Design an enzyme around this catalytic site. Structure first.
Site, mmCIF file in Angstrom:
data_model
loop_
_atom_site.group_PDB
_atom_site.id
_atom_site.type_symbol
_atom_site.label_atom_id
_atom_site.label_comp_id
_atom_site.label_asym_id
_atom_site.label_seq_id
_atom_site.Cartn_x
_atom_site.Cartn_y
_atom_site.Cartn_z
ATOM 1 N N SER A 88 0.764 -1.167 -0.099
ATOM 2 C CA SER A 88 0.001 0.073 0.004
ATOM 3 C C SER A 88 0.834 1.095 -0.001
ATOM 4 C CB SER A 88 -0.892 -0.018 1.260
ATOM 5 O OG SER A 88 -1.554 1.310 1.522
ATOM 6 N N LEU A 89 0.613 2.084 0.930
ATOM 7 C CA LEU A 89 1.176 3.460 0.949
ATOM 8 C C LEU A 89 2.722 3.200 1.186
ATOM 9 C CD1 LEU A 89 1.637 6.426 1.786
ATOM 10 C CD2 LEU A 89 1.071 5.721 4.093
#
Length: 349
Positions: A92-93
């Site tokens: 993800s991030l």
């Protein structure tokens, strides 16, 4: 053994993130260079880390910046140990930080990316979302999820993070616990990342990240994407860390387990994050023959000890790391009357 850098994403925050590690020069000095990119926007990451409170663990623009700015510093310590990665995987991030470690992203372009990625999301006032890690096969999810509750993260062979409507989580977990299913909520500051919720933001983000990332650098085959199906890895989108890519990462499902597949069998996996979220997942979803190592434990009395503890572990693993790169160089020649060594090198006689 190969070394695999794993970069944990959201939910991975907590009051007092690497306040202990600020002491270490290699660390601080990198967190300051992160300020240098964040200054024209009137923001100081080092304050976000130290004026920290509940609301800023929840503020999504502080978080994307906090996490990324720390991960980027952890990565820096790892490069002082003299430990470059054989494989790379983002979750993800995290990917942002990864693109730093693979070297497609400047510390600046990386930091400011996270910053905007988080900003445009906050300013889209998107509707009340909320995520959770829930333990069912990716296909078991598509079968048993209330409408409008997407499967978003493929972590393990039997652990997936569903994303969706805040209120439809609360009453779909009151409902899951009552059948003994793995369920730990991820702190998202209310936003359903990696779902359809994000399409609304894509336009304005893409249009803006295009000003942060000119020009885009080639990614290396060392870095396995978790934002693009393994199918289209030789594609146009997949080939470079471009705005178009950064945005896709926020919109499409994170294919984690998929990348873990490619992880060899005597591999050493480090979780590069302000907190060892994916320890459960990695150990579950990988060979018993692989050693898995955190770098920081949330709420720990002194991360600086817990990091050295694990720098130590990275040694017992068999990897080549050398702590003298964390602290200032020693003034060779050594002082006179500095303890002998040969008498303590005992063998198998």
């Amino acid at each position: 053994r190969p070394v695999w850098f794993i970069c944990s994403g959201m939910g991975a925050q907590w009051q007092g993130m690497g306040l202990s590690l600020m002491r270490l020069d290699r660390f601080r000095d990198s967190i300051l260079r992160s300020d240098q990119a964040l200054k024209p926007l009137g923001l100081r990451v080092s304050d976000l880390l130290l004026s920290t409170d509940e609301a800023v663990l929840d503020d999504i623009v502080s978080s994307f910046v906090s996490l990324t700015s720390i991960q980027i510093a952890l990565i820096d310590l790892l490069t002082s140990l003299g430990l470059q990665p054989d494989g790379i995987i983002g979750h993800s991030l995290g990917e942002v930080a990864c693109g730093y470690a693979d070297g497609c992203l400047t510390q600046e372009e990386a930091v400011l990316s996270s910053y905007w990625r988080g900003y445009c999301i906050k300013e889209a006032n998107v509707l009340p979302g909320a995520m959770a890690a829930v333990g069912l096969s990716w296909e078991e999810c598509k079968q048993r999820c209330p409408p409008g509750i997407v499967p978003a993260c493929h972590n393990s062979k039997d652990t997936v993070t569903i994303s969706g409507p805040q209120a439809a989580m609360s009453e779909f977990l009151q409902q899951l616990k009552r059948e003994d299913v793995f369920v730990k909520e991820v702190r998202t500051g209310g936003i359903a990342f990696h779902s359809y919720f994000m399409e609304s933001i894509a336009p304005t983000l893409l249009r803006q990240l295009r000003k942060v990332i000119l020009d885009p650098k080639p990614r290396s085959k060392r870095w396995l994407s978790t934002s693009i199906p393994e199918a289209q890895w030789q594609g146009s989108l997949a080939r470079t860390f471009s705005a178009e890519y950064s945005v896709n990462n926020l919109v499409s499902p994170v294919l984690f387990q998929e990348a873990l597949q490619h992880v060899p069998a005597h591999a050493v996996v480090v979780e590069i994050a302000p907190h060892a979220l994916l320890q459960a997942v990695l150990k579950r979803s990988l060979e018993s023959s692989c050693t898995i190592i955190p770098l920081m434990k949330k709420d720990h009395r002194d991360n600086l000890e817990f990091f050295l503890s694990n720098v130590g572990r990275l040694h017992l693993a068999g990897v080549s790391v050398n702590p003298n790169g964390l602290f200032p160089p020693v003034e060779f020649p050594a002082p006179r009357g500095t303890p002998l060594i040969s008498p303590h090198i005992k063998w198998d006689h």
